[PDB]
Amino acid sequence: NFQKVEKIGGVVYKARNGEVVALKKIISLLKELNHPNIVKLLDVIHTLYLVFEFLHQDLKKFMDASALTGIPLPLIKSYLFQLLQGLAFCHSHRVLHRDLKPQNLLINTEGAIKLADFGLTLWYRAPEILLGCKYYSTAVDIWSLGCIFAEMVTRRALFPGDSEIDQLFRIFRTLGTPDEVVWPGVTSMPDYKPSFPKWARQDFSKVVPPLDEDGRSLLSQMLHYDPNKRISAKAALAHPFFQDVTKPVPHLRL
Ligand SMILES: O=C(O)c1cc([N+](=O)[O-])ccc1NCCCc1ccccc1
Numbered sequence: 245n246f247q248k249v250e251k252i253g254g255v256v257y258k259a260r261n262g263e264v265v266a267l268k269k270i271i272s273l274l275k276e277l278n279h280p281n282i283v284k285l286l287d288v289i290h291t292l293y294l295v296f297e298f299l300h301q302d303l304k305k306f307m308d309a310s311a312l313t314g315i316p317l318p319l320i321k322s323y324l325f326q327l328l329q330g331l332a333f334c335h336s337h338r339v340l341h342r343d344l345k346p347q348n349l350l351i352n353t354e355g356a357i358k359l360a361d362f363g364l365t366l367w368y369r370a371p372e373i374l375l376g377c378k379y380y381s382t383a384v385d386i387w388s389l390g391c392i393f394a395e396m397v398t399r400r401a402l403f404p405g406d407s408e409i410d411q412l413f414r415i416f417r418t419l420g421t422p423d424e425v426v427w428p429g430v431t432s433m434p435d436y437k438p439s440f441p442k443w444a445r446q447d448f449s450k451v452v453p454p455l456d457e458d459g460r461s462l463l464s465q466m467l468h469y470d471p472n473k474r475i476s477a478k479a480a481l482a483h484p485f486f487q488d489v490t491k492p493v494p495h496l497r498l
């Protein structure tokens with residue numbers, strides 16, 4: 245039914261129906277849900293295939309293309325604001341993403357960005373997932389988005405771990421080793437070990453330097469250890485960081 249065009253990255257292909265779509269080779273309630281910052285799910289076929297609307301670039305490629313100059317702050321702010329709108333919608337319908345990362349974030353020439361590749365490589369994982377919590381919450385997505393925010397600002401991954409424990413210890417070295425004071429119940433997590441090294445929390449203005457105090461404040465709330473203290477998508481949208489948000493159009497080379 246579909247003329248393959250190319251492989252995007254189960255497997256995902258750009259395909260032609262004359263509609264151009266993204267065809268994923270490996271739910272139906274999601275087809276009826278609609279938000280400007282969420283990729284549209286067009287079809288489900290089980291004979292498992294998912295058919296999605298097609299967008300031409302992802303944030304990972306755009307950040308690489310922007311590496312030598314960086315993404316302008318107004319565009320970083322617009323993208324973060326839009327991604328939070330998408331998450332606030334998802335979370336209000338009790339849908340988690342669980343695997344947010346720059347290559348899952350799709351952009352177009354109009355200035356829009358959309359959530360894709362839902363989890364329905366460790367760099368964006370929330371600490372409660374790494375510590376073995378089985379019933380994690382909408383807060384895991386806010387953590388991932390905070391990591392992506394930091395990466396847009398600094399042009400380097402915040403926590404580029406190469407193993408589960410290296411990921412955890414990279415988080416601890418920056419944010420401090422969590423304890424019961426800042427995260428009640430952390431020492432009862434399934435994979436918590438009393439033998440974890442105890443690192444002090446680094447000064448936060450060292451971590452995303454050029455970012456102003458509004459952005460650092462928001463980031464800090466997105467990276468709270470306690471999922472119950474971590475800011476919600478809805479509350480983040482009201483943060484003073486977004487008082488001057490606009491929707492710039494990006495320079496895309498396709
Ligand atoms: O356009 C979608 O819907 C989509 C969906 C998924 N996904 O995992 O569902 C993953 C990527 C998607 N776009 C690809 C945009 C970047 C891209 C464009 C051309 C070649 C290589 C890479």
Ligand SMILES: O=C(O)c1cc([N+](=O)[O-])ccc1NCCCc1ccccc1
Pocket residue numbers: 268270271274275277278282283284285294334337339360361362363364
């Ligand atoms: O994005 C994927 O790759 C994906 C994968 C599966 N799955 O079961 O593998 C199932 C759904 C998937 N996206 C659905 C996106 C539409 C959507 C998302 C959130 C709220 C409202 C509407």
